[PDB]
Amino acid sequence: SEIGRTTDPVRMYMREMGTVELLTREGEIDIAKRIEDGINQVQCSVAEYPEAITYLLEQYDRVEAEEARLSDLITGFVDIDPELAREKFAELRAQYVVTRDTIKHATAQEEILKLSEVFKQFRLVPKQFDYLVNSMRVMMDRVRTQERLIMKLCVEQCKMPKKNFITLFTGNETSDTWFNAAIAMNKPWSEKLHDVSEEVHRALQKLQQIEEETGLTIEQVKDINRRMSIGEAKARRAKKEMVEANLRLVISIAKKYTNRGLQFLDLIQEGNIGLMKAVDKFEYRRGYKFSTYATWWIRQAITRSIADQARTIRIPVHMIETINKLNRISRQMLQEMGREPTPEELAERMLMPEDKIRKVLKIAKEPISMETPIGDDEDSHLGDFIEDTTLELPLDSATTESLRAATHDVLAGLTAREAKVLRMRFGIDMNTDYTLEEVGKQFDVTRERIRQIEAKALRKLRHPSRSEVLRSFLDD
């Protein structure tokens, strides 16, 4: 189509963004219903893992003795007072204790779905719900890379048929009777394989703890993890359908922030991040349109990024808000008084001390480019008028070397002991100076004798016999 005719990233963004038609009032409701359907689907899948609801039950047991409050674990109930939640946790507890004692296998496979759809009633907070899902995630991910290294324990031995190797591995999972038929195959590969049949043992039996740790076996929670992925990827592509359809809301908001130190695309990217938060935190059951909430989050993200990354030397958000308040107060006083308000009267229009306002006024200036043309000459820039102030003048370098030579003369006009006491007492010809105790430990002498030595040496160097070379280094 129009592809290839522009390189501007903002034209490309707008062109690619406009291919998504907006949502109606009932479109947002459908998409939010799909999102919550995905998250309750992953809820009802993880309810198949019973240690999850035991964790939530012992969390309520923590709420029993005020380890937490109720608002931290449950945000509501669909089918907020502590009145209902007591019988709610009784409902989940009664289902758990009736599901515990049953071991069978079609007899014990409806009780789990009863558990899941009694647990569906809980509108969990993101904290606990995230905790359970990433917990079961890391559990089967470690045992799953364990299964994957059981497979690639054959690749170190040989290259092997996996399509013949998948028919064996599943379902026994407590023994090597699936591995016993591998030598009934006896193609060359399955020679090498069996010699590592010992170092697979500690792998192939250790998931046998989880075979009784969750109460389930690995193929059941395998399908549970698969339906977990289906549910969360269902919610993820539904949040994406609500983010992509409100990308013009971001632009309508972000055009109001344009020249405040950020490029247009920086603003709409930060607004996009805020919009993704707004989608994550939207409740359609409040009966409000998506624009009313999403505007709050988009405004937050955009103004926060302007506060953070629009200035070269960054000032905090508290000082950003103080500067904004000062500028608004000042443009009101300028309109009233008909002139610029002096910081003294600006200190009574605001209610801050006057030197605080003076330093706030000193803060706000932005650094000048060192390439600004001076007088718009464009052959003379600001940066070539800036001198290096850290250098020392070569007259001062010549003076320092002359002073070193003079000090060497004067200190050679002393005895070795006094010259050593002075060369250690100050840092002369050394990398460090020393205390009286360190110089005394160098001479196995207590500190006051070193002090006396150094005093008499300073007395000698003060004389008119040795000090006319040195006194010339003190400017009169």
Partner: protein
């Protein structure tokens, strides 16, 4: 320390190895306490401590514990200067194409992947996909997919194939390619097809692939995955005095890169929808592309000014980049500046330096002597003493400047005499006092000019200022050899007034004992300075052994020439002052003293000339009054007659007999004649208006008018200005060049009225604006010439070559523009030049032809000398000293180590501000000579040439040529070959408005397929009375004889084929259209009569000669020697064939027919013959006629421009630039070598390769030498530092980077950039020591 400089691509591991830590945050500094923030663009932990030996938290503060890393904040304890050296790095969340290798044409990523830049850009801007590998599918590698094609070919082919988009895809492509398999496949696809430009594209890509294989560069390093962060002390954030900060723009660009990178990492951790992550990847790509080169892709990023940000590439590129602002020239200590003022008491070697400037430029020297002499106990005491300006620091200062020269420099330093060393003389003013004779070299007048003083610090620099640059060493110009320290306006007027003669001047005719008696008489008032007297003059001749021998004779002189003789050095003739000395006579006097007696007496002579000219110019009181502009009294009569004539032409135009065109032309010509009559009357009335008495009788002499003495001395002005003072100031031109039909009849002594003054300003502002805008046009040419020739040094003494160019005096038509002596003075002969009587060697083979040898050559009549040139020099990397010839500025052969490239480029480019923006009549006697002699005798007994390259020269009775013209083909010559004529003897006659068909042999007319009606229109006019024919042109005839072309043949009255002499092939006249045939079939025509007739500068010229720019309508040349034939005509572009005698015949052309072809079918041609006519292209001259031919063409075509404006440049200086243009070669046959066919190599490389091949018997490569203009030859050096500091830094640096070049620092720009000695001059010995101690 280091022998070369290597550039290459940067691996991401190499970048992580430069860095001292990752820059994770855009935080520059804290705002309350301005300490640098952690992980920021200014970090004390990454980039080192902000104070000397001090931790940022202050826990470690002294250099006791140095190098320790404070565990509280990890800043090291070391010098803060490490913030100028320690880089950091930004780890990019997604890859990002380097814009220099993506966009700088030709795109290297496009050239590598064989993928067009629009498809690459559509892939990386996330518009299209590209299948990085297909597998067992119908999708090849580089095949781009749009969105929907990828979307469906997903589920048709599953996940078998892999396609991607973005710079991740381009990096996967660049990593997934095998370079040697690709280059070998390119070689086998090269050896298959002979398409020329396809073979050239393949060779471009082959050289790129093998450059990636030779160097360690991997292709995928053209895609950034780690970014380097410049050290913070080079992008400083500094507090200004007012509490405000000033920053570099790189802090903005780095800050933006970091922001978009961190937001990309957040979007990747949030798993944003892919629209958002693609937009952020496009924005990070944009931000890195704006950091590296701002404004190259699309729109520049402007920050906070709506003024674009200065990126990393803009720091190193352009007139404000590092290379030109900071490396090739820099601000310098021990330097001052002041207004220049005269001080004519000085000697030639000294300037006047104010004491107040010398006390400051020499401050460490004075501190040294103040402590050495015990006057100060301490350098601080000495600082206070020179601040108080105590009376002893003035004696110390007189001591420290004593033999210490200073460099004085006036900008523009157009040529090397713009910097000269003078010994200082301390003066009391504030203006530098510049000795007058040097001003002409500096181009200095004292109207506000200022000069800069520099102090040579070391002993070597003091001895170079004494020995190389002192102004008593620079008395000759490096361009022509002529003296450049030469008297001027006041001096020459004083010496001209002194050496003139009045008729009855006081004290005439007396006899004088010598010059001292003349001076006594003149100072007593007893003889005028112009009294013609008889004075006894003792003068010394240089004997043949070298010693001086006296002679004494009463000369007839004036008193003033006698007085002037007292300052003339000894070995000079008296005839050198016994004349009225103008500017040219004094310049020749100084040149004579230099060539006879040498430098040391010439310097004393020049100062004596200045003092005596100043003195006697003062004595004359030569003043300009208004009566000095004498207007001829015949001016009003001349102007009234011209007005009568133009009014007659006007009332004739009312009578309609003349068009407005010829009315205007005749009015202009009868005002131009009036202007010249007025100027002649004015000058004749002015130049001899002194008519004075001798013994009563009146007698006219040259005038003593002040205006005329100033014009005639050469002091100031010319007759062209005296014309406007006293004659009329003539016809003006409008701004568009067309001259106004009525002139300014008034001159500046009268008034210009208001209208004439307005008309005057029309052209005055045009001249001033031309002056203002052509200095930038000339300075750029000079820069291009210096950069094409900067690395040419005289490196040998003799290359032993025997070739050379044949120097002849240049003769344009009927006058010599330059004699042989001016073109061979100072060059070295290449063969024994022998007398016109053969076998008597006049001059041996390898002699420098100094003035003695040129006088010997002029005693004889030698007209051509084969002489050694630099284009013909065997030395690779340099030139030998014998092939160059004489040092123009010293007058001896040139020393080994001289940077003749910079001298040649400055000598060409310094005069560039003085430039802008029919039958044959023999003139005087001589034997007529012709070249390309093919003659026949016409019906009337004349000679008529059967050739088109015949030219008519005139040998003189001594054997030399004195004029040469070029005759058109078949011109009727009234005087035959080898005959004598006199002045005005018209020899060759023709008419330019038509071209004849010359009869081959005498015979009868017949028509070879010249069909009536198919090839002609029959016409009948009454003026001559005869019927005739016109041959049909292309668009006006039938099918048939437009294709089969009409011819006419020779048949006698018997019906037999008559032939041409020597060859019995059928002789035909193949006639093209638009020809007038007024002969009938069966008429008797003698050979030589017509059978049918068919009708028909400045500074940019120098620029587009040295730039080798192809002319718009190039003269087509004959490639191979053969016989012309024709292919498919009437196509819009015809086809021509040349048929050699013993070579492969078919050789085609695409000659467009809208230009008249200037040869005929039956005859032969050879290499270089002009088939068509037009301005010749130097590439064609080089390919067809040779190297020396394009050398002769370029030096003739540049000296043509410089000789209009009276500028004398030598030809060594143009031959040096030509040699540097003929620096590449193109391999045609690869030989037993490593060079590929058709690829362009350095010429010396292929020459030394052939030398070592033929040394071991093997066959060498054959090459065609190429002509590159000075820009394309400056950018095709073997050094990326020279070529990158010249211009187009981005192209040079990207090409050198992907090729992995290595700069061995051989020229002069690379050694000025790194702060080393240049390998030319006094730093030549050091570089030879360096290459004799490292190669062994």
């Amino acid at each position: 320390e280091f022998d070369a400089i290597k550039i290459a691509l940067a691996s991401p591991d190499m970048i992580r190895s430069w860095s001292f830590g990752e820059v994770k945050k855009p935080e520059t500094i804290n705002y309350r306490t301005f300490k640098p923030e952690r992980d920021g663009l200014f970090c004390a932990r990454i980039f080192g401590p902000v104070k000397d030996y001090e931790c940022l938290c202050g826990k470690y503060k002294r250099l006791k514990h140095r190098g320790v890393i404070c565990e509280k904040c990890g800043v090291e304890v070391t010098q803060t200067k490490v913030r100028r050296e320690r880089m950091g790095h930004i780890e990019l969340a997604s890859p990002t194409a380097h814009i220099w290798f993506l966009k700088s044409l030709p795109s290297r990523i496009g050239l590598l992947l064989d993928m067009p830049l629009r498809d690459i850009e559509r892939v990386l801007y996330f518009e299209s996909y590209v299948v990085i590998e297909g597998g067992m599918t119908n999708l090849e590698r580089q095949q781009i997919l749009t969105e929907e094609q990828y979307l469906d070919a997903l589920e048709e082919f599953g996940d078998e194939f892999d396609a991607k988009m973005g710079a991740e895809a381009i990096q996967a492509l660049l990593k997934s390619m095998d370079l040697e398999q690709e280059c070998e496949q390119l070689r086998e696809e090269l050896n298959e097809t002979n398409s020329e430009t396809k073979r050239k594209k393949l060779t471009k890509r082959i050289k790129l692939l093998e450059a990636f294989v030779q160097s360690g560069n991997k292709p995928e390093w053209m895609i950034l995955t780690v970014l380097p962060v410049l050290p913070p002390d080079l992008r400083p954030l500094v507090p200004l005095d007012g509490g405000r900060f000033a920053t570099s723009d790189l802090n903005d660009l780095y800050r933006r890169v970091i922001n978009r990178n961190n937001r990309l990492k957040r979007l990747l951790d949030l798993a944003a929808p892919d629209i958002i992550v693609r937009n952020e990847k496009r924005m990070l790509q944009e931000a890195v592309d704006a950091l590296l080169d701002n404004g190259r892709r699309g729109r520049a990023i402007t920050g906070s000014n709506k003024r674009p940000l200065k990126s990393l590439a803009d720091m190193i590129k352009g007139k404000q980049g590092r290379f030109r602002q900071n490396l090739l020239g820099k601000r310098v200590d021990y330097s001052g500046r002041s207004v220049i003022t005269v001080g004519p008491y000085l000697r030639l070697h000294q300037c006047g330096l104010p004491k107040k400037m010398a006390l400051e430029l020499f401050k460490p020297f004075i501190y040294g002597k103040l402590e050495l002499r015990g006057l100060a106990t301490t350098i601080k005491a000495a600082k206070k003493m020179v601040e108080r300006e105590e009376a002893v620091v003035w004696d110390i200062l007189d001591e420290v400047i004593r033999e210490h020269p200073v460099l004085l420099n006036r900008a523009p330093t157009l040529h090397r005499l713009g910097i000269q060393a003078f010994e200082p003389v301390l003066i009391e003013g504030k203006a530098i006092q510049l000795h007058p004779l040097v001003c002409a070299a500096y181009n200095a007048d004292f109207d506000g000019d200022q000069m800069a003083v520099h102090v040579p610090l070391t002993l070597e620099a003091q001895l170079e200022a004494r020995a190389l640059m002192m102004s008593t060493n620079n008395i000759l110009s490096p361009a022509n050899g002529e003296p450049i320290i030469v008297p001027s306006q006041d001096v020459v007027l004083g010496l001209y007034y002194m050496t003139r003669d009045c008729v009855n001047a006081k004290g005439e005719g007396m006899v004088l004992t010598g010059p001292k008696e003349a001076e006594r008489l003149y100072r007593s008032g007893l003889a005028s300075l112009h009294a013609r007297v008889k004075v006894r003059i003792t003068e010394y001749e240089k004997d043949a052994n070298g010693e001086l021998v006296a002679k004494t004779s009463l000369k007839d002189t004036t008193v003033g020439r006698a007085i002037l003789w007292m300052i003339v050095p000894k070995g000079l003739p008296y005839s050198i002052v016994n004349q009225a000395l103008g500017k040219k006579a004094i310049s020749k006097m100084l040149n004579t003293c230099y060539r006879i007696l040498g430098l040391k007496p010439t310097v004393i002579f020049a100062d004596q000339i200045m003092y005596t000219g100043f003195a006697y110019a003062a004595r004359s009181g030569a003043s300009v009054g208004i009566d000095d502009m004498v207007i001829p009294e015949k001016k009003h009569e001349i102007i009234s007659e011209a007005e009568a004539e133009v009014a007659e032409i006007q009332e004739q135009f009312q009578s309609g007999l003349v068009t407005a065109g010829e009315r205007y032309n005749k009015v202009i010509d009868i005002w131009a004649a009036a202007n010249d009559r007025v100027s002649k009357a004015m000058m004749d009335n002015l130049q001899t208006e002194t008519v004075i008495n001798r013994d009563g009788q009146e007698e006219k002499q040259v005038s003593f008018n002040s205006i005329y003495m100033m014009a005639d001395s050469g002091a100031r002005g010319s007759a062209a200005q005296i014309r406007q003072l006293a004659g009329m100031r003539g016809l003006m031109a409008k701004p568009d060049g067309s001259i106004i039909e009525t002139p300014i009849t008034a001159n500046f002594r009268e008034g210009l009225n208001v209208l004439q003054y307005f008309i005057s300003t029309h052209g005055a502002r045009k001249g001033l604006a031309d002056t203002a805008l052509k200095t930038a046009n000339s300075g750029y040419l000079t820069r291009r010439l210096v950069d094409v020739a900067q690395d040419l040094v005289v490196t040998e003494d003799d290359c032993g070559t025997h070739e050379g160019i044949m120097m002849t005096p240049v003769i344009e038509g009927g006058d010599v523009k330059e004699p042989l002596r001016d073109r061979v003075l100072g060059r070295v002969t290449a063969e024994d030049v022998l007398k016109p009587g053969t076998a008597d060697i006049l001059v041996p083979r390898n002699t420098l032809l100094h003035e003695q040898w040129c006088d010997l050559l002029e005693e004889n009549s030698v007209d051509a000398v084969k002489v050694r040139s630099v284009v013909s020099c065997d030395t690779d990397f340099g030139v030998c000293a014998h092939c160059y010839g004489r040092d123009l500025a010293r007058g001896h052969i040139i020393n080994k180590g001289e940077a003749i490239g910079v001298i040649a480029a400055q000598s060409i480019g310094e005069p560039g501000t003085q430039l802008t923006m029919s039958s044959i009549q023999v003139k005087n006697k001589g034997s007529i000579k012709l070249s390309n002699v093919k003659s026949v005798v016409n019906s009337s007994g004349k000679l008529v040439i059967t050739s088109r390259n015949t030219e008519l020269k005139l040998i003189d009775e001594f054997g030399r040529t004195k004029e040469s013209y070029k005759v058109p083909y078949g011109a009727v010559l009234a005087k035959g070959d080898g005959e004598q004529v006199a002045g005005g003897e018209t020899v060759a006659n023709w008419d330019p408005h038509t071209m004849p068909v010359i009869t081959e042999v005498s015979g009868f007319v017949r028509f070879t397929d010249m069909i009536d009606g198919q090839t002609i229109t029959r016409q009948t006019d009454e003026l001559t009375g005869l019927s005739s024919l016109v041959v049909l042109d292309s668009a006006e005839r039938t099918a048939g004889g437009k294709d089969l072309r009409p011819a006419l043949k020779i048949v006698d009255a018997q019906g037999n084929d008559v032939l041409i002499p020597g060859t019995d092939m059928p002789a035909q006249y193949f006639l093209p259209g638009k020809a007038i045939v007024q002969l009938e079939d069966g008429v008797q025509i003698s050979s030589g009569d017509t059978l049918a007739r068919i009708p028909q500068g400045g500074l940019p010229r120098v620029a587009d000669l040295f730039e080798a720019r192809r002319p718009k309508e190039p003269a087509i040349l004959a490639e191979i020697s053969g016989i012309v034939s024709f292919g498919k005509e009437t196509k819009g572009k015809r086809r021509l064939v040349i048929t050699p005698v013993d070579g492969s015949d078919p050789y085609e052309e695409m000659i467009p027919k809208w230009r008249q072809l200037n040869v005929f079918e039956g005859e032969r041609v050879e290499r270089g013959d002009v088939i068509s006519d037009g301005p010749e292209a130097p590439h064609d001259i080089l390919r067809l006629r040779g190297v020396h031919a394009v050398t002769r063409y370029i030096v003739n075509e540049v000296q043509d421009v410089y000789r209009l404006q009276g500028v004398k440049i030598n030809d060594k200086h143009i031959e040096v630039i030509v040699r540097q243009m003929l620096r590449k070669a193109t391999i045609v046959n690869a030989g037993s070598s490593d060079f590929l066919e058709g690829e362009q190599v350095e010429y010396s490389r292929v020459k030394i390769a052939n030398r070592e091949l033929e040394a071991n018997g093997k066959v060498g490569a054959t090459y065609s030498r190429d002509l590159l203009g000075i820009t394309k030859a400056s950018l095709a050096t073997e050094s990326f530092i020279s070529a990158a500091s010249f211009q187009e830094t981005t192209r040079v640096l990207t090409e050198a980077a992907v090729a992995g070049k290595r700069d061995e620092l051989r020229g002069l720009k690379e050694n000025v950039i790194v702060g080393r000695l240049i390998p030319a001059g006094t730093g030549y010995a050091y570089h030879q020591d360096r290459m004799r101690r490292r190669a062994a």
